[PDB]
């Protein structure tokens, strides 16, 4: 049963990869969808056994590394944390593959697309089920490999090609730090196995623990697109929408969160790292929402929402509330995949295939089913009470105030603004696409029709999960005293109770008031008083609008300064070292020295009695001179060469 959950998507990758030429376009897509579905049913069967019956599965294929004390096995273990992670991964992957059957039906290369999509699914299953960090790193790298091939899938497009490289290189920067953390783990503990390392967490030096997890923190930022290594995330929109619906929902963007939750037995014994995770998450929630309120591409707006929500998971980990982070991780994968799916529905429906909300407007009637999915998913994203996002996001924001520390209070306002900005950019996206006066040509609206049932079916399934799912699963992850020993919480760090009993009732509804009250005010201005949003008039507003629309000018600073100077250093080394001083102290320099010396010696070979007689008689001075003068004669001779 465990081998079925892990390796069945890998067989689907092989079939559409090598046998796609032989089974054709139609059957290749569905056989890959068959392989993912087998993993879906296998995962659900294992979910009952693990979570509800406390049964662990472990399959040890064979040994990988056997160098003295360092022993690494090809083992996969499924426990509460691992099987919980498979629930968003495998379920959303299946509903994205089934979505891609009709979305990609016009693409000339569909066997390759479903091969990369299923290979990506297999890598993510490997990451969360490996019994040690090296097996996690194997999935960690091949997620980046598969993300590179998916983002650059349309490789004739120059933008998609450079975007796939950008995602690969930034993640490979995170991999270089993850390798160092694993090397330090072998140095301090002698092992990478979870069972060995996690037993020693209390007895290891704090500095050793801090070094390992700082390396893990840098790797986490690259994959989860936290501030500093978040530039590739919006470039990842160059891939097909099914890639976005998968990468940004239950996949690569959540890998960094998993790495930190897995390391909780170690991460709890280093407050300094947890403080950094808190602040880095808080900064990225604030910045993502502010950028998303003046963004105009529909997929970029949703992508920035993904970055904002992952930062909500980081602040939960920062206050050592790992259980809340895992629960919000599962719930977010449902209604964020829905938002990407329902965005791709609108883009396909409009016959011009625009992606700019400024070219949309008045779509609500013509595509009512697409509007309903976005509406419910946005309300779930906006943590509207009763919905799945409400049971996972409201508690995380309130936990910042429940910390009663300086950092917790600062990050509460950052989270509160991000919660308010979430409502703002959700209403703005809905107004421009659906409720605004039509900006598209009249010909677009007479042809604006809903897509087929294969596209619709996964959206309906995810729509229900975005309504009820959080309420059903809340007690497993958020219930007080619920045993989740994989996520270790130190007794000094338990704040779930003061979060639940000590907060004022004004703060219990403050995120709800600002989002609902602020959203209505924003909606009125568009419909009735749009003259306030002609920001090109005011020069200060134009500069403030331009700063956030250009994403805090980070991409410009990265390319123009860090990447330009990184390539220029190679040029300076190439010019002044390899082709420079190493040639002067090499072939070119010695050739000039040889030519100068050999030209002097060529003038001394000529048949002349007086010349050789003078040299013979001159040599007699070596007999006359005392031998201490030899080095002065040597210096004199070198002068004559010149």
């Amino acid at each position: 049963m465990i081998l079925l959950c892990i390796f069945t998507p890998f067989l689907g990758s092989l079939i559409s990869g090598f046998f796609g030429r032989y089974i054709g376009v139609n059957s290749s897509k569905w056989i890959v969808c068959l392989s993912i579905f087998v993993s879906v049913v296998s995962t659900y069967i294992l979910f009952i056994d693990v979570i509800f019956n406390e049964i662990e599965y472990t399959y040890n294929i064979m040994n990988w590394l056997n160098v003295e004390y360092l022993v690494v096995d090809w083992s996969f273990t499924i426990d509460k944390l691992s099987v919980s992670m498979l629930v968003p991964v495998v379920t959303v992957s299946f509903l994205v593959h089934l979505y891609s059957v009709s979305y990609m039906s016009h693409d000339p290369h569909q066997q390759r697309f479903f091969s990369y999509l299923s290979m990506f699914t297999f890598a993510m299953i490997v990451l969360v089920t490996g019994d040690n960090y090296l097996i996690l790193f194997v999935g960690w790298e091949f997620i980046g490999v598969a993300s590179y091939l998916l983002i650059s899938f349309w490789f004739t497009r120059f933008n998609a090609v450079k975007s796939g490289l950008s995602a690969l290189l930034i993640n490979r920067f995170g991999d270089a730090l993850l390798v160092l953390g694993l090397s330090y783990l072998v140095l301090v503990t002698g092992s990478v196995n979870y069972n060995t390392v996690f037993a020693l967490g209390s007895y290891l030096d704090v500095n050793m623990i801090t070094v390992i997890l700082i390396c893990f923190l840098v790797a986490s930022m690259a994959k989860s697109a936290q501030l500093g290594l978040h530039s590739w995330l919006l470039l990842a929109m160059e891939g097909p929408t099914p890639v976005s619906s998968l990468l940004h929902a239950a996949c690569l963007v959540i890998a960094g969160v998993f790495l930190l939750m897995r390391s909780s037995p170690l991460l709890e014994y280093t407050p300094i790292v947890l403080l950094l995770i808190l602040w880095l998450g808080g900064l990225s929630t604030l910045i993502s929402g502010l950028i998303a309120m003046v963004s105009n591409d529909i997929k970029k707006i949703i992508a920035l929402s993904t970055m904002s929500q992952v930062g909500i998971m980081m602040i939960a980990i920062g206050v050592s509330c790992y259980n809340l982070a895992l629960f919000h991780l599962i719930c977010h994968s449902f209604f964020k995949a829905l938002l990407f799916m329902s965005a791709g529905s609108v883009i396909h429906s409009i016959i011009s295939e625009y992606q700019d909300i400024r070219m949309y407007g008045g779509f609500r009637q013509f595509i009512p089913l697409a509007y309903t999915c976005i509406f419910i998913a946005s309300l779930s994203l906006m943590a509207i009470p009763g919905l799945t996002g409400f049971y996972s996001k409201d508690i995380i924001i309130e936990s910042m105030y429940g910390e009663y520390t300086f950092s917790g209070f600062i990050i509460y306002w950052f989270a509160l603004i991000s919660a308010t900005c979430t409502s703002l950019y959700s209403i703005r996206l809905i107004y421009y696409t659906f409720l605004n006066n039509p900006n598209s040509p009249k010909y677009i609206y007479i042809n604006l029709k809903e897509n087929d049932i294969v596209l619709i079916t996964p959206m309906i399934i995810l729509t229900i999960l975005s309504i009820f799912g959080g309420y059903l699963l809340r007690d497993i992850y958020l219930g007080m005293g619920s045993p989740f020993n994989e996520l270790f919480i130190h007794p000094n760090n338990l704040s779930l109770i003061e979060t639940e009993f000590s907060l004022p009732s004004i703060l219990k509804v403050l995120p709800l008031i600002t989002g609902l009250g602020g959203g209505l005010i924003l909606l009125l201005i568009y419909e009735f008083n749009y003259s306030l949003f002609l920001v090109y008039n005011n020069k200060n507003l134009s500069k403030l609008y331009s700063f956030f629309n250009q994403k805090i000018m980070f991409d410009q600073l990265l390319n123009n300064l860090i990447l330009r100077s990184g390539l220029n250093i190679g040029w300076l080394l190439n010019v002044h070292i390899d082709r420079g001083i190493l040639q002067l102290f090499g072939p070119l320099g010695l050739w000039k020295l040889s030519t100068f010396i050999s030209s002097k010696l060529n003038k001394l070979v000529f048949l002349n009695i007086g010349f050789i007689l003078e040299i013979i008689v001159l040599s007699w001075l070596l007999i006359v001179f005392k031998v201490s003068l030899l080095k002065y004669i040597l210096l004199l001779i070198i002068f004559i060469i010149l």
């Binding site: 040994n63 091949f142 070292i577």
Partner: protein
């Protein structure tokens, strides 16, 4: 039995090819019958000889004991003692496996004189293979430098436009530096009266004399790996040498430097090696970082791969100078993994593209995946092997080498992890361009990878992944041999 048969059989093979192909030189002006199809029969005999050499080492491998400490198959031939251990056995097999590959890579891309090329390839392979089984310093130097004579003529006859520059570079950089290593060998023979491996391993010399001997040997080793700043010969030699010459240079010749550390430095100059390790680490780390940034600005396809080889061999040098089993095993596995991936990248870059378009400038190639999909698959697959993606022997070599450096020196050994980022920066910048955008306007559509070039790529990829997934095939053989190199007295 091994050395005697490996030398006698190949001499008979060398003489046989000379007798057949030179029997008709005497103003016959005839048309012969072996000259047909680009000397097909003479090529086939040399190809068979290369495969038979792999069979000879196998017969001695069946009797190899992985649980025996010391040299095995101890033999005397030409007044020289020959022996094998776990480390030597794997390097001999790697050297001999690349023999048929070097011949087959140049099966039909030489302007002529196929008998000369095949003899020189088989002559280079045996001399390098014999260098792993000698048991004294002088025999190590004799085989270390004997390869220069055929390699110099191989480049100058079969090379590219700048072959004259490349032939001089390899002859002068390597001969001048090895003569400094000869000075240290002469000192050993003067004060100890022997250069035998076991005899000199037991003698402790004065810490000042060990410094002078280390510097003499390290000069010869550092040029041949190569390390900064004496690396400038390699990119010029690789871009002009024939494809078979690049395969042997990138697959075997560079690995002799790591084996030089294993024999000529670690067991005999143990005390001074610990003193020199920080200097070795600094030189190697900067070799790794500088070569990776320099590789970004390169515009020649075969020079980009040449600089990629320097970055990974700096990691091999870092691992072998770690004083632990993890680093030593990691450096050895990385040597074998590099011994397959690096020749494969030269076949893709300088054996397939060059044989079709005869131009190595990067600006002419893009979007190759549109009409060369099979080439793009192998190019992409080997690119990820070259950056140490897991499931490849390169990663297992790189991870253990980086881990061994961290254990040896936690502060400065952590800089070795830049190999993970920097190698992917220049390798995936080249691959993303060859497989990106519209098919190049400067190219005409031609044939994709042929059966011969598929065969070469497959049998260099297969060992890389088998070692990557189950390296215990290699670590079991190396375990007892590598444990003898560690120097430490814990109290």
């Amino acid at each position: 039995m091994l050395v005697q048969n490996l030398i006698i059989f190949n001499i008979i093979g060398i003489v046989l090819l000379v007798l057949l192909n030179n029997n008709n030189n005497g103003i016959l002006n005839k048309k012969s019958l072996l000259t047909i199809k680009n000397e097909l029969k003479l090529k086939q005999i040399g190809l068979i000889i290369s495969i038979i050499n792999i069979l000879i080492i196998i017969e001695n491998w069946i009797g190899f004991n992985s649980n025996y400490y010391g040299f095995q198959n101890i033999e005397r031939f030409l007044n020289i003692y020959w022996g094998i251990d776990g480390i030597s056995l794997l390097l001999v097999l790697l050297t001999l496996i690349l023999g048929p590959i070097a011949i087959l890579s140049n099966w039909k891309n030489l302007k002529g004189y196929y008998t000369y090329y095949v003899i020189s390839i088989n002559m280079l392979v045996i001399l390098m293979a014999l260098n792993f089984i000698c048991l004294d310093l002088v025999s190590f130097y004799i085989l270390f430098e004997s390869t220069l004579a055929p390699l110099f003529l191989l480049i100058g006859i079969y090379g590219a436009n700048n072959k004259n520059k490349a032939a001089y570079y390899v002859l002068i950089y390597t001969l001048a530096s090895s003569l400094f290593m000869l000075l240290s060998i002469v000192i050993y023979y003067i004060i100890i009266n022997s250069t035998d491996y076991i005899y000199i391993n037991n003698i402790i010399l004065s810490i000042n004399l060990q410094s002078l001997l280390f510097i003499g040997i390290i000069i010869g080793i550092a040029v041949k790996t190569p390390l900064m700043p004496v690396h400038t010969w390699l990119p010029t030699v690789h871009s002009e040498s024939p494809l078979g010459g690049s395969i042997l240079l990138a697959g075997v010749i560079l690995k002799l430097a790591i084996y030089g550390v294993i024999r000529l430095l670690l067991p005999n100059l143990s005390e001074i090696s610990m003193m020199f390790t920080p200097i070795i680490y600094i030189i190697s780390i900067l070799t790794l970082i500088y070569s990776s940034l320099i590789t970004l600005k390169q515009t020649d396809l075969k020079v980009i791969i040449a600089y990629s080889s320097i970055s990974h061999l700096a990691v091999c040098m870092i691992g072998i100078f770690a004083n632990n089993l993890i680093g030593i095993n990691g450096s050895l596995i990385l040597c074998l993994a590099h011994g397959f991936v690096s020749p494969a990248l030269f076949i893709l870059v300088g054996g397939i593209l060059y044989d079709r378009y005869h131009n190595r400038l990067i600006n002419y190639y893009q979007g190759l995946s549109t009409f060369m999909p099979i080439f793009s698959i192998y190019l992409v697959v080997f690119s990820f092997c070259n950056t140490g993606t897991p499931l490849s022997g390169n990663f297992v070599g790189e991870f253990l080498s980086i881990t061994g450096a961290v254990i040896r020196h936690p502060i400065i050994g952590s800089l070795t992890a830049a190999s993970v980022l920097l190698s992917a920066c220049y390798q995936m910048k080249l691959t993303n361009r060859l497989t990106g955008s519209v098919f190049s306007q400067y190219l005409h559509i031609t044939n994709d990878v042929t059966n011969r070039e598929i065969f070469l790529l497959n049998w260099l990829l297969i060992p890389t992944i088998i070692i990557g997934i189950y390296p215990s095939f290699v670590t079991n053989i190396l375990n007892l041999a590598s444990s003898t190199l560690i120097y430490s007295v814990l109290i």
